[PDB]
Symmetry: C3
Subunit: 581 residues, 3 copies
């Protein structure tokens, strides 16, 4: 507060001031132009190529047992796998569901032959292997090992030959120059190797005579032809149905189908936002040439497929497709297939690498969303504020006429004296006067002229604590008027409260009564409340559902662990340096 | 900087001020319930238990002794299982094992004697030390090779009884398991005889399994010891019931303060502590529906009580018995309401991010809506409040107030409690002249309070007399008069500046820029939140994680299987 | 609307009121102080130590072949790998690039010897292994397998010895007490084991004689060549000191502009470029307390300097020495402050950086909204204080209206100096109020009332009282508002819910407020709420896709391969 008093000499043209005129208020931004569309999002494909294959091989075993007195002991059990020749796969196994009891094949640069039970060759029926949970189908000919008849004090050999046929899952990873079987065996030939148109261009690490391709092939299940591939390796023969590389594999995978994908141009790039998955992708304005995608023949297909299925299910009756689907590369390695729409209301080759984290895009979407909202609303507050200030000037132009000192003091920033000199305002500073130098007189009446009373209290004061006593009249807000003119006709029931210092001086019947604190008068406010509080600090702690360790441990068997342990066997349970001689 | 003439308004057009609008009200406010919660996630950890392996390393070498040397012609190596009886009576009961092996290998009952000597029981001594390895025990430590007999082939046998303690792991549905050695055991770790245990899975003949009640583990309390003898070994592990041993769910987070609220037919569980907000249907999730999840009810209470005591026992009270809800993302929430005293498997996502974004978004949303709502309300109140001032201001200067409210220069005058307005006519600045004297030539001591003017509506029109009003208004009636006074100084708005007069005599025009300006405006400087781009960011990429493994099985196999193609001939056949 | 009339008795000092004086407005917070700086963020290293090694071994094979009359059959094929002796590697392989056609080594506690083709030992020239995609380099001496010469009705043995030398990649994980080769072969010796200064302290599970270290070795700069001979092979690799060689941390992010600030007794490192804010204590982290983390200080400086040069050398100056802090989540931060010219342990890092991006995002928005709304609150307080001055003049002009608005109910008011005396007005039913037809004063020609006359009763049965219409439906008890009768008299007086129109000082008719054009004194503001939004779970790759990304699954291959006998053979049957 300022319970300090003031004297305000009449202002002279010395200083003149004018009110600032209306400011040009801001205008609301044009507004973003969004394009309704359907989108299909693709990601780098990390899944291997999977296809069915059949294995044809024979387990060949030759035991050596020495029959001692009362017992017999294995001296050695030689085991090996032999590939079933093409001819035999075609004419025996596939044609008749049978297999020879002999195994003739090349091993260690030598053609070796093995007869089951060691006797004359005979065709054998393939029978279902023994059931087993979570396993493919298998078939074999024999089920018992063949050991030599006993002959004491002698070493004898026995040959076993179990013809085995197994259907197995096959897998291949880019660039598909080789593949693996579910048994752990690698095949160093492309799953797409063949003779038909350019196929022979694919990779193969085997001599020509090891591979065979049979057209219009029919398989027998122990109804359409297939081009059947047949590769015979040193340990087995493997077959699979040949299909062309390009309409089969893809370096991308469909990831998200988005009904409502808004697109907008902004600072040289497109923003693709999906309210449904709370994501915003960013791309250049120029489409990405789909043909540049190394083996991505599934994208166009998949997008069209999904795209039409969505159009029908949701826009066929309210919008129209605007042009051909477009393709864009988003930051993070996401390929977006986009189909613009519009409501009727109007009427070198390379591989894309994708990030495993979509968080940046969700943060982008979230941030953009809040940002847009706060800039929009606070922007409106600003415009409304400016407008209100401009509007207010009109009221101040009228107030300044009724009370120039008060309006000027508020506007100038300090207690001043003022008066209108036309359309401008002349002002002069007022001089402070210590409260202890001001005396309020007991009477407001004028004996001089009966019936006439002063309208406000009379006073006596001095500018300096030692200075002379000057008489005047009390004005508003502690102003000391040098003239005692404020008068009126004495009235009955005279009651008044005048601002005096930090409280009021009360008069009744034109006589001083007493002073008081503002606390004795009830207060009413002209102010409109507004309780704004700050958004408080918040801390985000690291948080994971599963740690890399839990994940590493989610696997039943750990190859590294198993190898580490198993290879310590000798250092643990055996001597390695002792040379017995 | 345009002049206007405003004719007296006629009842022609009458306007009124809009009255106070109904101001918005603050929304009710969300009701939150305090509570304790435990969050479960899909269990991806393998069932783990200890087991012992009993088997013998059977080796039989063949050596051909040359004159100046000796050379191996072959080295048969096999693994023979140790018979039940021998583990029971010899290993478990004595800590010894036979120096011979007899088992079924390739549909034949083979038999081997260590050193090829008579059967002897042998001392099982601890295996040689090795870092990060379980405990092991064996009998022999050397390989027996036939004594030299130049020019002949000879076969020598070896038998090293080995017992190993090893970790066992099994994954749902637990119908089989594996050992630290990589050996699979196709029998449920919970297979047995005791109540329904025989129901479990097994792929062996009844006579390969054996259960020993009240067994007493030897060490080179009772347990219902299980023993399986496989073609290459025998393994034993303590039998325990299935249900109280495994769980398809895992405790993930313990939450002291988990607020719950209901909106739009869903429950929102948010944790300030971990900045997460889960969402669920209002209906609880039948904990009984959880395939093998008896650990849930357990862990939950355990934790909820520990927390209750540690933090709310002295200030709040539990309400009802714990509830269970299925949240989006596959998280199971055990919830325990509080109050101030005052059959299938659940699949869980590996990313909690959606729920934290949810929490973050919700928290900010709540705040801006709350505050901007208060601003909207206060703005409406202020506008209504101001009307009272406009009502007084209009009686004082109708033209000005009406012009601001109407939006264009108009004329106005009150007609009771309503305002009559009429449009004003613009006048080119060049068609306006200010006369030099404000004094009245026919009445002594009487002066015009405001400057007189001579103008013409049209550039060719007659010259009209009148006096300058405020804000460039041209008054047709020169009735603004006052007693002439001494020291007369005045500045009148004229065009885009002021016309200065002294002692009722024109002096000169000035620019507003020549006069000091003071503002009646309260400033406010709002700036926009600027654009921000978030780039892709990962601590470890999936490639780094793949490389984190010491050995890669695919890589190893890929390379090893190329051996013959790289260092040998796979096609050439020799005949002679 | 109100729809109710009021009689307002003259106020008596009974109740007096004053306006609240200006409130002290809030002040703008000081404002956060940010230190510009360069940073380098490190994470726990999950990558194994990698180094090159060379393998020396020999494929030894002894086949047993029985020569039938028309055919031939392998009776058994013994295959083994033999380590190449130190001496041979040195003097034969490394020296002349050849190898012995013989394999002498220890197997199963016995020293066996093998002669290729079962012939006299001869030095053989090593040759490049057959070409193969994505494979290291290898060399061998023989291409074919040797088999016994044909001899009908006889068992025969043939020996093949193929000397093989392969350059392979080696890998080792902390504590580095052992390592593996690309072949899957484990080597239980520290890649750092040796003789030179404390090396012998490193781990090793082999007898001293198996190991050999050759200083000043060749193969164009000498090296300390290690050579370990295991039961199945001999491996060599250039020795290097452990300390500088391996690291338990990995440089992760190089940040040009990393702002640092402190609050609540903690440091905040925020990067606008990667949208991340790290949190740490005010106390540096002893870099030396980092187990084997010798790469940190080096990499930090290399990076730090490169960046300073490229971006701040011409406008900023380094301040102090590089400082190091540990951030929540297990991130080690190397920080270099700038200014314009104007026991021991291993850090464990989280896999998810999201908490830190959320932190940054939230702080950025929080900072912005608190700033602007805070400015709104200040401007609002100032405006409320500012307008009191207008209210001070208004109250003088229309005390009843200004007081009614400030008091919150219809009251009567008058100034008693600088305070306001007020009294409550009494309501009157609209049906108890009658507007006279004339505003003319018969008993005083030329004199007319400026506002309509009325009659009314406080109660539906009470006497009828005379008076005149005031503003906003006030019923004044004194018919004193008079004026000079004039021409073309036109007036609209608020009456009930609308107006009463008077012409030529004569009642004409009443009308709805709808008959008059409405203009507004209100400034509009259209604020709308930010709407609810649901974030659904979303992953690029599920953990199952990741699991499946591996070409061969060991668990799957083992599970299946061990079911061979159970599927294609009888395990329980003795004959
Ligand atoms: Na003005
Ligand atoms: Na306020
Ligand atoms: Na009004
Ligand atoms: Na006041």
């Amino acid at each position: 507060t300022d319970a300090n008093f003031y004297v305000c000499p009449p202002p002279t043209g010395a200083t003149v001031v004018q009110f600032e005129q209306p400011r040009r208020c801001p205008t609301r931004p044009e507004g973003q132009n969004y394009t309704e569309g359907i989108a299909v999002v693709f990601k780098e494909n990390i899944a291997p190529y999977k296809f069915k294959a059949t294995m044809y091989y024979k387990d060949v075993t030759v035991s050596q047992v020495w029959f001692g007195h009362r017992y017999s002991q294995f001296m050695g059990i030689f085991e090996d796998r032999a590939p079933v020749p093409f001819e035999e796969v075609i004419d025996k196994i596939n044609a008749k569901g049978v297999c020879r009891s002999t195994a003739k094949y090349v091993r260690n640069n030598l053609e070796t032959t093995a007869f089951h039970r060691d006797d004359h060759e005979t065709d054998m029926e393939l029978k279902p292997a023994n059931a087993a949970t979570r396993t493919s189908r298998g078939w074999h000919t024999t089920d018992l090992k063949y050991n030599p008849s006993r002959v004491e004090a002698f070493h004898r050999y026995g040959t076993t030959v179990n013809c085995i046929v197994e259907e197995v899952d096959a897998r291949s990873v880019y660039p598909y120059d080789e593949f693996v079987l579910a048994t752990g065996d690698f095949v160093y030939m492309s799953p797409f190797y063949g003779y038909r148109e350019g196929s022979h261009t694919e990779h193969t690490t085997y001599a020509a005579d090891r591979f065979k391709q049979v057209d219009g092939f029919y398989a027998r299940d122990l109804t359409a032809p297939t081009t059947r591939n047949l590769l015979t390796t040193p340990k087995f023969t493997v077959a699979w149905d040949w299909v062309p590389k390009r309409p089969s594999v893809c370096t991308m995978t469909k990831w998200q189908e988005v009904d409502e994908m808004l697109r907008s141009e902004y600072g040289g790039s497109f923003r693709f936002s999906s309210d449904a998955i709370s994501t915003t992708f960013t791309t250049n304005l120029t489409e990405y040439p789909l043909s540049r995608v190394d083996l991505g023949d599934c994208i166009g297909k998949d997008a069209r497929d999904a795209m039409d299925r969505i159009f029908a299910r949701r826009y066929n009756a309210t919008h129209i497709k605007v042009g051909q689907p477009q393709y864009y590369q988003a930051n993070g390695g996401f390929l977006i297939a986009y189909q613009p729409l519009l409501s009727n209301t109007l009427a070198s080759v390379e591989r894309i690498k994708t990030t495993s984290s979509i968080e940046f895009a969700r943060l982008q979407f979230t941030y953009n969303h809040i940002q847009r909202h706060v800039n929009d609303m606070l922007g409106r507050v600003a415009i409304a504020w400016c407008e209100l200030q401009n509007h207010e000037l009109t009221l101040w132009n009228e107030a300044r006429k009724l009370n120039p000192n008060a309006i000027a003091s508020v506007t100038v920033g300090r207690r001043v004296s003022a008066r209108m000199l036309g359309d401008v305002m002349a002002v002069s500073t007022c001089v402070p006067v210590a409260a202890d130098n001001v005396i309020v007189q007991n009477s407001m009446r004028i004996s001089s002229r009966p019936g006439a009373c002063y309208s406000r209290p009379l006073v006596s004061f001095r500018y300096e604590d030692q200075g002379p006593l000057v008489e005047g009249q009390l004005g508003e807000n502690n102003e000391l008027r040098l003239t005692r003119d404020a008068i009126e006709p004495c009235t009955v029931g005279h009651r008044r409260y005048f601002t005096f210092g930090g409280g009021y001086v009360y008069f009744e019947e034109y006589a001083y009564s007493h002073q008081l604190s503002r606390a004795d008068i009830t207060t009413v406010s002209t102010f409109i409340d507004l309780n704004i509080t700050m958004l408080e600090d918040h801390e985000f702690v690291p948080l994971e559902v599963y740690t890399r360790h839990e994940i590493k441990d989610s696997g039943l068997l750990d190859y590294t662990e198993v190898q580490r342990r198993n290879q310590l066997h000798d250092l643990r349970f055996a001597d390695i340096d002792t040379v017995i001689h």
